[PDB]
Design a protein around this ligand. Structure first.
Ligand SMILES: O=C(O)[C@H](O)c1ccc(F)c(F)c1
Lengths: 237, 300
């Protein structure tokens, strides 16, 4: 069934699973036309497909050409997401294929189930977690590859950098979700926290800075403070 | 006109014959039903006064043989049987008729209800859904499950309706996933009509049979089949005009006949609201929409 706080350790067991977030697939800017009407302009998007145990991120870049001449783009985007996830599964060796795919939005359930009919043993599940994966485009290196793309492309990343050398996947996922929630809540302030110390850099082959264990504790505290600060500002608390 | 004589009525029972029903008292001098219109299938059905559990009954066509009902005190039900001695059968019927021990099928001349509910229903197709080849009539009851229900337990006692599953490989061509899921025309026209049913008459016959089993027996799997066959048409953007017009007629008479007080258990709110207000055919079922909005506005 649905995945929630009760069965949270399930995410880090040895059954291969993927989260799929479609938030950033269909992205637009809204603007006025010369005649005073409103029009949209699509920009490149991405599918965020993540193994929460290993950190492997399959970032499928959705180039704006896939929308050309198509109607009902918000609906199509869900089917295109499901088509691409299905294609990814088929591309993986059998022993790497997931046993479960967890969609972050319930509207992805039917599209994905229909595309995965050939895989009756792969469970397609929703979640009651509110996950901040929409903020993936606040990670500078991910935003850059998406915006620079001139054609459809798949790029592989490890969203945990080398953290799993020192921490468990439960702790890594918790760190990731705290960072992404802070980036979603106040992107400017979160990036300031992450980059305010020029002596701590992001390796060429990494997404996040090279913090020591003690420095990660400080950063995590500051991210929590940011989220609480923004909560107080929002609700006048 | 034809006749279904009864050996006796040893237990008090409500007897249905098509859309009609009447009560028989324990050991009342009742010996059957006469004046049954030739040319249609019929259903004779039972609900015991002392045990409303198991509604059950028999689909039959008097053109296929001479049938009678005899109570079985071992199995505890009214059983249909076939009499192969025609001379003997005509004699038994004539005696019951002279002694006025039979009720008359109470058809009003103006009334086409039964024809309208069974227009496409044929006994030969009933006998393929309900498999018991040694008899020319078919037993159905309230508890019989369908083949689809069983896949999700005795196969010999099942309702072999055509399996319809919108999220199945049969319904969805590889490479046409969004297309086929949002517009079921392929599944309706190529898979179901051209492939399995061969024509719309057979499709409507199964739809009509499913409705009647739902209504007369409270058979839940039959209700599911009836709604699935409606939804498949309504969810197809390409349907022959003559099928849509005929469906509107079929559904109108079904909604008209449904007991008002069973609407809560026999009508699926989701399917009807989708079909009448959201589907491709939301504007193609004018007569059914009108009766539904006037008779069951709550459901909508
Ligand atoms: O009298 C009998 O032989 C049985 O009671 C019986 C046998 C066949 C029938 F058609 C019928 F109505 C009654």
């Amino acid at each position: 069934g649905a995945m929630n706080s009760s069965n949270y350790a399930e995410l880090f067991n040895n059954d291969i699973k993927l989260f799929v977030d479609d938030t950033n697939v269909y992205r637009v800017t809204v603007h006025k036309t010369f005649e005073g009407n409103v029009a949209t302009k699509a920009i490149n998007g991405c599918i965020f497909t993540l193994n929460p145990k290993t950190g492997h991120l399959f970032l499928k870049i959705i180039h704006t050409s896939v929308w050309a001449g198509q109607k009902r783009l918000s609906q199509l985007a869900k089917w295109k997401t499901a088509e691409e996830v299905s294609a990814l599964v088929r591309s993986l060796p059998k022993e790497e294929q997931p046993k479960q795919i967890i969609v972050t939005r319930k509207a992805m359930l039917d599209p994905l189930e229909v595309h995965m009919l050939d895989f009756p043993n792969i469970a397609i599940r929703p979640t009651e977690l509110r996950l901040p994966f929409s903020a993936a485009m606040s990670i500078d290196k991910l935003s850059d590859v998406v915006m620079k793309a001139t054609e459809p492309q798949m790029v592989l990343f490890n969203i945990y950098d080398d953290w799993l050398d020192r921490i468990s996947s439960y702790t890594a996922f918790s760190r990731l979700t705290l960072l992404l929630r802070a980036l979603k809540t106040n992107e400017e302030s979160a990036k300031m926290i992450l980059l305010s110390d020029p002596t701590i850099t992001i390796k060429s082959y990494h997404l996040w800075p090279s913090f020591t264990d003690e420095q990660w504790i400080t950063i995590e505290s500051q991210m929590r403070d940011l989220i609480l600060t923004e909560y107080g500002r929002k609700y006048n608390v | 006109m034809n006749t279904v004589p009864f050996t006796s009525a040893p237990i008090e029972v409500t007897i249905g014959i098509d859309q009609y029903s009447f009560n028989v008292k324990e050991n009342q001098p009742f010996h059957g039903i006469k004046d049954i219109p030739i040319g249609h299938v019929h259903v004779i059905h039972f609900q015991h006064a002392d045990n409303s559990s198991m509604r059950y009954g028999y689909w039959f066509d008097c053109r296929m043989g001479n049938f009678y009902i005899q109570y079985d005190p071992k199995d505890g039900l009214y059983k249909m049987m076939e009499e192969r001695d025609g001379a003997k059968f005509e004699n038994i019927v004539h005696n019951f008729k002279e002694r006025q021990m039979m009720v008359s099928y109470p058809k009003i001349d103006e009334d086409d209800t039964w024809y309208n509910l069974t227009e496409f229903v044929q006994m030969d197709k009933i006998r393929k859904i309900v498999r018991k080849d040694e008899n020319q009539f078919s037993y159905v009851d309230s508890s019989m499950t369908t083949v689809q229900e069983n896949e999700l337990s005795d196969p010999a006692h099942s309702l072999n309706y055509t399996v319809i599953n919108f999220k199945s490989r049969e319904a969805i061509r590889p490479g046409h996933e969004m297309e086929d899921f949002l517009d079921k025309s392929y599944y309706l026209n190529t898979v179901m009509l051209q492939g399995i049913f061969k024509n719309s008459s057979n499709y409507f016959g199964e739809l009509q049979f499913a409705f009647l089993n739902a209504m007369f027996f409270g058979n839940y799997g039959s209700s599911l089949q009836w709604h699935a066959m409606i939804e498949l048409i309504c969810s197809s953007a390409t349907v022959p005009k003559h099928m849509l017009d005929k469906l509107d007629e079929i559904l109108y008479y079904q909604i008209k006949t449904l007991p008002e007080q069973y609407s809560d258990i026999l009508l699926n709110e989701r399917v009807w609201n989708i079909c009448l207000y959201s589907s491709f055919q939301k504007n193609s079922l004018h007569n059914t929409e009108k009766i539904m909005e006037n008779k069951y506005p709550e459901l909508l």
